Amino acid sequence: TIPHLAIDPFSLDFFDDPYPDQQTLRDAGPVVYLDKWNVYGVARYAEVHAVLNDPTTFCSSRGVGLSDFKKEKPWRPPSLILEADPPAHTRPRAVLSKVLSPATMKTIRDGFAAAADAKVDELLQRGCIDAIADLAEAYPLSVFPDAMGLKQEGREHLLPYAGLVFNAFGPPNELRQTAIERSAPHQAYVNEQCQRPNLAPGGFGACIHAFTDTGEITPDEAPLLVRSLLSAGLDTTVNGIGAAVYCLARFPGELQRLRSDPTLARNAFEEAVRFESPVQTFFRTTTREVELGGAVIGEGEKVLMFLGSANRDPRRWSDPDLYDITRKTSGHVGFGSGVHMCVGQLVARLEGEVMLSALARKVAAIDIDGPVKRRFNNTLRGLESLPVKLTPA
Numbered sequence: 001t002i003p004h005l006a007i008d009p010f011s012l013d014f015f016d017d018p019y020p021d022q023q024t025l026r027d028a029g030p031v032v033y034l035d036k037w038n039v040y041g042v043a044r045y046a047e048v049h050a051v052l053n054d055p056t057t058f059c060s061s062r063g064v065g066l067s068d069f070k071k072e073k074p075w076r077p078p079s080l081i082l083e084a085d086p087p088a089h090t091r092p093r094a095v096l097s098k099v100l101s102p103a104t105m106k107t108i109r110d111g112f113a114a115a116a117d118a119k120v121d122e123l124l125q126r127g128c129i130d131a132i133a134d135l136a137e138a139y140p141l142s143v144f145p146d147a148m149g150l151k152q153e154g155r156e157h158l159l160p161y162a163g164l165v166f167n168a169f170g171p172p173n174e175l176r177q178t179a180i181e182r183s184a185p186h187q188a189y190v191n192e193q194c195q196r197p198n199l200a201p202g203g204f205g206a207c208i209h210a211f212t213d214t215g216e217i218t219p220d221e222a223p224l225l226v227r228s229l230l231s232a233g234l235d236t237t238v239n240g241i242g243a244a245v246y247c248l249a250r251f252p253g254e255l256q257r258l259r260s261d262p263t264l265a266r267n268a269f270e271e272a273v274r275f276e277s278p279v280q281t282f283f284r285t286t287t288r289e290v291e292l293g294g295a296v297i298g299e300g301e302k303v304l305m306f307l308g309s310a311n312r313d314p315r316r317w318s319d320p321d322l323y324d325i326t327r328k329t330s331g332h333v334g335f336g337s338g339v340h341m342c343v344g345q346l347v348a349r350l351e352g353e354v355m356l357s358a359l360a361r362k363v364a365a366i367d368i369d370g371p372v373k374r375r376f377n378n379t380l381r382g383l384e385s386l387p388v389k390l391t392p393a
């Protein structure tokens, strides 16, 4: 019944150009079996959306990587939010939702916008820059560690730690093995900063610890929830912003539409999240036998969801392979969907909006002017180097 495919979605050849294989995965059927890793796969929009919104059968507490926590030891203590199901998920989720709330965005907006404006003006004085190191990495590094309340010492471990986190959701390939091996110094840095004395009052970390007073989380839960923000809160935005700049560099007509109406910045960023899908894949584990796409999946099976594929499925999207900054993007799964839908989405969108606003108001053209290099990661899609020349407006 179910088609068996040999495609390795975690191979460098797949990362280098995933789109033909993603069509093969969609068109093979609503559910496939990936023989390379002994997992089920769903790559169409409808089934990806259905699985994400069925948490009692497609659970997260057995891990959202390939590893099944019922079978193998997690490489670090489980996340209290990402790797938890309701009801254990609910109060930790509520704390992060409140720490990263609409009201909280008012406190950081002016600084985040000012830093984006200043960065674009700085890059315009240089002309020829790397949109990854000098923009997609530099801007989040300039605002997010500070908004967390992190000390200065040790921040060089943040991106390596996140690279490890996202590689570790993958299969035990070379990317994962290399990431986990000798990772203790990155772990030790992050785990130390999660302790309350190391977090500046008023920042996201200290605010998490302040919620221990309410009964929503205990004091021993707070460091792990700070850890969640230090795991997911930086490298995602690096690849999201890099994706947006790469889109604007490749689609000059859309950069010009954004210039003409900078209030399209928020949706231009959202469209970049759909179009590139910085988070490409993750897993669920079945808690029971379940029919999906006409396949009977047994209990305790891993199911791989192709978020980027769902976001390009022509069954759902018109002209899926076009970047369109006025597209109605609502419903894309680049931030997930359902009970685990990105709790940091307001921070991600704030960063993306204010950077694209600064570009819209200050830049007339973005021209690739050196070799583009891809950055390989088992979960994240993005570039290692994006040399561009910025022409001022």
Ligand code: HEM
Pocket: 060, 064, 081, 082, 083, 093, 096, 100, 228, 229, 232, 233, 234, 236, 237, 239, 240, 241, 273, 278, 279, 282, 333, 334, 335, 336, 337, 339, 340, 341, 342, 343, 344, 345, 347, 348
């Ligand atoms: C463009 C940037 C980002 C993208 C594309 C993204 C994507 C995602 C996705 C797809 C999920 C769902 C995972 C699942 O269902 O298993 C998720 C969850 C999560 N994200 Fe985001 N993320 C981004 C930025 C951020 C930021 C800035 C933060 C924190 C400041 C953050 C923190 C989290 C956390 C803690 C979760 C777990 C939520 C839960 O399990 O309830 N992410 N993200």
Ligand SMILES: COc1cccc(-c2ccc(C(=O)O)cc2)c1
Pocket: 064, 065, 079, 080, 081, 082, 083, 165, 169, 227, 228, 229, 231, 232, 236, 279, 281, 282, 283, 379
């Ligand atoms: C499994 O695919 C994703 C996609 C986006 C964010 C994350 C993520 C990683 C770690 C945490 C955490 O440590 O809680 C939370 C979210 C995972």
Ligand SMILES: [Cl-]
Pocket: 076, 186, 187, 188, 190, 191, 227
């Ligand atoms: Cl850790």
